[model samples]
Target chain A: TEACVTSWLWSEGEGAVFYRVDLHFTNLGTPPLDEDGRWDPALMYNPCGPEPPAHVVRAYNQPAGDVRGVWGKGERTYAEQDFRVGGTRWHRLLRMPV
Target chain B: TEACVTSWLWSEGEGAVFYRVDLHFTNLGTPPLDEDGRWDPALMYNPCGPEPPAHVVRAYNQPAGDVRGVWGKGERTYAEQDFRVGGTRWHRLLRMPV
Candidate 1:
């Protein structure tokens, strides 16, 4: 199945630090993909377009850390945040004041 | 087969309001998807596993309002924020604060 790639992180409280990224695409033949979201290993992976491109999700618990990136491989193993909860998407970076 | 679900919006300026959501997945087949990202309409649509599931990207603008949701279709129409911009993702609730 063509799956979206998402990544997120947060260690402890709302003040905890985290990063998230999402890669979006179309005509992605299937999953269990290599690093680049390409179906065929022999073929060159097609990069997403400038707009309506691969969806990237990112988050950081702290203001200083860099936003990390992850390939959504159908397994929420390392990432910290869950997107299926179906919460409101607006509201910029959520930070718990220390 | 499996594409991430994403949605966002912004009506006016940086002070404008918006929202975002992303659905992540793994064993997905390809793209040009159903509303729910299921490969077969006949079969029951599998809800994303609690972790590392489909990637979702979301954002909202406003002190008061709900976040919105959208499927990360190949077309980048109707949404406001661009994830591919490749910037720092760890800031909370960015508002011009008029």
Candidate 2:
């Protein structure tokens, strides 16, 4: 499994801060296949921060095609996909210990 | 339904091409609320291209905390969530029209 950071952004509220991060994932091994012969949804997972942001607002996957040159090569053609985490937040800080 | 293009990326396959576009949404009015006092899931929608790329592989919503200045001012605080469209694709062209 390989992960790449695409981009990230921030938004600020009165007492809180929000963040969104995008990423792309590539499986080095054979991914699990569902009944429909498509990649199973379970192959995707949340890659958010360990602390669990104040809100785990969104998680979704996008379709991706293999960029490696292997068309018609009988290389078990598979589409690439990315998992995204959006709307993560952290509450405002009221104080800091010296 | 305000959409801001956060970022985009591209991947190529043997006979196909893929594109991923990310966006963020902010509601100017009171968003519909679910029974659980959270923003209704229906508020989220696909923001992909009209052509409906080769695949609408994934669509999901993220939790967003309100960034507007209304922490204590009874401004109907709500979080800003983004709808993501991933893994859109267009088949490769084998010929060019004169």
Supply candidate 2's per-residue lDDT for A7.
Answer: 23
* Residue-wise C-alpha lDDT for candidate 1, range B1-98, written one tens digit per residue: 23333332222322232222333322222323356432221122222323212212222211222213232234332322232112322111211100
Those runs of model 2 whose alpha carbons end farther than 4 Å from true positions after fitting are A1-3, A18-24, A43-51, A54-56, A59-98, B1-98
Candidate 2 local Cα displacement, residue A88, angstroms: 12
lDDT (Cα, 0-100) at B56 in candidate 1: 20
User: For model 2, what is the C-alpha lDDT against the true structure?
Assistant: 0.26
Worst 10-residue lDDT window for candidate 1 chain A reads: A89-98
Question: Which pairs in model 2 have colliding backbones?
Answer: A57-B62, A57-B63, A58-B62, A58-B63, A62-B86, A63-B86, A63-B87, A64-A80, B54-B89
Docking class of 2: incorrect
TM-score of chain B of each: 0.21, 0.28
**Can you list each candidate's DockQ?**
0.04, 0.03
